[PDB]
């Protein structure tokens, strides 16, 4: 019999296994930070890999990529002033950037509708064919080293279940009603 095994393939790669998330590294000689997106849509620098800095890179058009914060459920969007933030809703006119690798091996992302380079700093400059890049604009995709167990936020807050009272007749909670009837 001929049988059908398969075709050549080399299985997954950079991440934990198929955790294809990467952290965007940035270095400006003096300092060094990672691109982080908080739960409220604030972008700042994280010196080490955090859960809010985990980004998923997924290309869309012919050469354009999509940067999504996998923990905050927010997309990286740029406005007309050049700022960047996080929005829970996708928009191909603002939350879409073009990627290109320079000669020094660093990746640069800029908006096709605003020409502003995605920069961690306040230097929201345009792009030039190999002139002077603004600071905090040259990124480097670094593999993820965080286990996927820490990527789900907890929930048992429950502030003041019964306060202190200093007279609790049932401290070990032996009496537990179940909320019945209506």
């Amino acid at each position: 019999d001929d049988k059908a095994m398969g075709y050549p393939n080399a299985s997954p790669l950079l991440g934990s296994s198929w955790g294809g998330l990467i952290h965007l590294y940035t270095a400006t000689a003096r300092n060094s930070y990672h691109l982080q997106i908080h739960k409220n849509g604030h972008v700042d620098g994280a010196p080490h890999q955090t859960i809010y800095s985990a980004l998923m890179i997924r290309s869309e058009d012919a050469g354009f990529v999509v940067i999504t914060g996998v923990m905050s459920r927010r997309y990286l969007c740029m406005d007309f002033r050049g700022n960047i933030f996080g929005s829970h809703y996708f928009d191909p006119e603002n939350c879409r950037f073009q990627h290109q690798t320079l000669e020094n091996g660093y990746d640069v992302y800029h908006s096709p509708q605003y020409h502003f380079l995605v920069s961690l700093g306040a230097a929201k400059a345009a792009f030039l064919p190999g002139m002077n890049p603004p600071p905090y604009s040259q990124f480097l995709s670094r593999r993820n080293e965080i286990p996927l167990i820490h990527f789900n936020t907890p929930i048992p807050r429950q502030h003041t279940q019964s306060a202190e009272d200093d007279s609790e007749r049932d401290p070990l909670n032996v009496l537990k009603p179940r909320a019945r009837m209506t």
């Binding site: 393939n9 010196p47 890179i57 690798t101």
Partner: protein
């Protein structure tokens, strides 16, 4: 006079992580002072940092309390700890060096995928297209259809329709197979696997023939 070693300019030590691509120069400086002259040692992940460990060597500048690398390699990744001490007192600081080994390239497609298949009518067809690219590629499945009489539009290009295109909530490994259940004579034609990252493009095509039982 009996002063303990201290950090003179701590503003030069805020960069904790040093991640540079292959063949790059890194500079680890630990400015310090004291009376008399203190020593400056380096530890590679808690071991001896001898110039015979790495190929090419380095250059330690004692005037700036720094060390200069030359074409870093992935073997040089780890933690570098500088130690300063003279009398009674030993301050130390640990940096982290990472070597990001990456090389951009056009999307590579496995030769032979998709392949021409013919399983008559009513059977199930599934084409495959193995894609790999570093800047993450985009996948589209196109079908060369015919509009009106012919099948070539303006200039000299064929008419195609979007069968399956990756989007936001799209698995990177689900765009590798194009499923065709039952199929019909309308599906007979040419199927193309268009893949492209941010450098160039790559595509393989395969014809589908539908016979009869």
């Amino acid at each position: 006079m009996p002063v303990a070693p201290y950090w003179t300019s701590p503003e030069k030590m805020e960069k904790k992580l040093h991640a540079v691509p292959a063949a790059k120069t890194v500079k680890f400086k630990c400015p310090s002072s004291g009376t008399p002259q203190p020593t400056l040692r380096w530890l590679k992940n808690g071991k001896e940092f001898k110039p015979d460990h790495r190929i090419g060597g380095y250059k330690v500048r004692y005037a700036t309390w720094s060390i200069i690398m030359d074409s870093v390699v992935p073997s040089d990744k780890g933690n570098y700890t500088c130690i300063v001490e003279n009398e009674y007192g030993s301050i130390n600081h640990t940096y982290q060096l990472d070597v990001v080994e990456r090389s951009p390239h056009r999307p590579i497609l496995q030769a032979g995928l998709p392949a021409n298949k013919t399983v008559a009518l009513g059977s199930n067809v599934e084409f495959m297209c193995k894609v790999y690219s570093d800047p993450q590629p985009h996948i589209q499945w196109l079908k060369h259809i015919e509009v009106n009489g012919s099948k070539i539009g303006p200039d000299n290009l064929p008419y195609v329709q979007i069968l399956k295109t990756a989007g936001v909530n799209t698995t990177d490994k689900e765009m590798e197979v194009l499923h065709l259940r039952n199929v019909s004579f309308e599906d007979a034609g040419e199927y193309t696997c268009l893949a492209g990252n941010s450098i160039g493009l790559s595509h393989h095509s395969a014809w589908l023939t539908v016979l009869e039982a």
